[PDB]
Design an enzyme around this catalytic site. Structure first.
Site, short mmCIF file in Angstrom:
data_model
loop_
_atom_site.label_atom_id
_atom_site.label_comp_id
_atom_site.label_asym_id
_atom_site.label_seq_id
_atom_site.Cartn_x
_atom_site.Cartn_y
_atom_site.Cartn_z
N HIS A 1 -7.97 -5.18 0.41
CA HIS A 1 -6.70 -4.57 0.72
C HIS A 1 -5.93 -5.34 1.83
O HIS A 1 -4.68 -5.50 1.78
CB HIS A 1 -6.96 -3.14 1.18
CG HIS A 1 -5.74 -2.27 1.14
ND1 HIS A 1 -4.90 -2.24 0.04
CD2 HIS A 1 -5.26 -1.36 2.02
CE1 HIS A 1 -3.93 -1.38 0.27
NE2 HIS A 1 -4.13 -0.81 1.45
N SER B 1 0.84 -1.22 0.00
CA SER B 1 0.00 0.00 0.00
C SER B 1 0.87 1.25 0.00
O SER B 1 1.58 1.46 -1.08
CB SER B 1 -0.95 -0.04 1.20
OG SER B 1 -1.83 1.08 1.10
N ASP C 1 -0.58 -4.22 -3.84
CA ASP C 1 -1.69 -3.25 -3.69
C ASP C 1 -1.18 -1.85 -3.42
O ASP C 1 -1.58 -1.22 -2.47
CB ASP C 1 -2.68 -3.66 -2.60
CG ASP C 1 -4.11 -3.75 -3.13
OD1 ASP C 1 -4.42 -3.56 -4.35
OD2 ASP C 1 -4.96 -4.05 -2.29
#
EC number: 3.1.1.47
Length: 373
Positions: free
Chosen positions: A298, A220, A243
């Protein structure tokens, strides 16, 4: 212990390294091939302040912090705490960067799986205030008696964000390069006194790194960190963005990534503005791959996907429609295949080369999101 054990044939050990002791030093969790999977007794979230930090991030109270601590405080992760390093082999090295609101210990399912396949994994703890919490020591004496100074997540303004998030991604890339330097220095006999007082002797790492087989991986915010670290530091040979959240990155970096780059996406996190920044990294002359894990969310890349049951998981968006074990296994095996191709490893991770292409029932090649060219 719903955190899965490594799938590979090496035993996994775990220790923490802080050096130097200041707010400017490196703090990392190490996962490594050990001399036994004897016991699997590494504490997952090792300090009560991380729970307070985690409460802050969720936007909640002193109460929620205590409740988290009550639920998760004594949970372990399947690595043998402070077990000796397995002698006789030079290991490839992964530097791992955590997401916003996380910290060094919350990606053990990935760290442990890589270690089990013969990698040393350094999961950095970032001091940019993107971590829910972290710590350092104000001076050498404070380190000696374990007297910690805590740093907690910074909350922003809607307006501040562009510049703040960019500075943070720049600090994070520098921490990643710095962790790499610390490990490479130790590998070459630099004497290092861990600021933590732990049974693992860092002198075990002398001559134990394959200095040419280095990779950066992250989730992320850590996925953007992968991209920034690769543009800056050509000691890293490939990167894997899990991600990625591309927002923090400057306009100029997209043309500045020579190394091979793999984007492994969840289905539900992703959106067009983010995907178009990923596509901006593609060039006729550079290796870029992308896959999306079907029905994943996520959190499927982080250890909290393993921490609750299926019902509570789904409601909290810690779990997706896909089984959490199945999703982490596909991401790890695609990653291994990628690392074998680009690090030139002599292993059999190439049996998963079709995963890099998204050729599995639980995978999409590329993204299901669409854009122009």
């Amino acid at each position: 212990t719903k955190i899965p054990r490594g799938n590979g044939p090496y035993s996994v050990g775990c220790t923490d390294l802080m050096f130097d002791h200041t707010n400017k030093g490196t703090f990392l969790r190490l996962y490594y091939p050990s001399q036994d999977n004897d016991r699997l007794d590494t504490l997952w979230i090792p300090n009560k302040e991380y729970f307070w930090g985690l409460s802050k991030f969720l936007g909640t109270h002193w109460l929620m912090g205590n409740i988290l601590r009550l639920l998760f405080g004594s949970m372990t992760t399947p690595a043998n705490w402070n077990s000796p390093l397995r002698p006789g082999e030079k290991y490839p090295l992964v530097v791992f960067s955590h997401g916003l609101g996380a910290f060094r210990t919350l990606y053990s399912a990935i760290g442990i799986d890589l270690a089990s396949h013969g990698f040393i994994v350094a999961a950095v703890e970032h001091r940019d205030r993107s971590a829910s919490a972290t710590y350092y020591f104000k001076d050498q004496s404070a380190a000696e008696i374990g007297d910690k100074s805590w740093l907690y997540l910074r909350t922003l303004k809607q307006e501040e964000e562009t510049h703040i998030r960019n500075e943070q991604v720049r600090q994070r890339a520098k921490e990643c390069s710095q962790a790499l330097s610390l490990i490479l220095d130790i590998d070459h006999g630099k004497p290092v006194k861990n600021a933590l007082d732990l049974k693992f002797d860092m002198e075990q790492l002398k001559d134990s790194i394959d200095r040419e087989k280095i990779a950066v991986i992250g989730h992320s915010f850590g996925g953007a960190t992968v991209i920034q670290t690769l543009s800056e530091d050509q000691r890293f040979r490939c990167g894997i963005a899990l991600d990625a959240w591309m927002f923090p990155l400057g306009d100029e970096v997209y043309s500045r990534i020579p190394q091979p780059l793999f984007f492994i996406n969840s289905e539900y996190f992703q959106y067009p503005a983010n995907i178009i920044k990923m596509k901006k990294c593609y060039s006729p002359d550079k290796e870029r791959k992308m896959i999306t894990i079907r029905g994943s969310v996520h959190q499927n890349f982080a250890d909290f996907t393993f921490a609750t049951g299926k019902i509570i998981g789904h409601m909290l968006k810690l779990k997706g429609d896909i089984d959490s074990n199945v999703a982490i296994d596909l991401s790890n095996k695609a990653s291994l295949a990628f690392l074998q191709k680009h690090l030139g490893l002599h292993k059999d991770f190439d049996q998963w080369d079709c995963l890099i292409e998204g050729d599995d029932e639980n995978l999409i090649p590329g993204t299901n999101i669409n854009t122009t060219n």
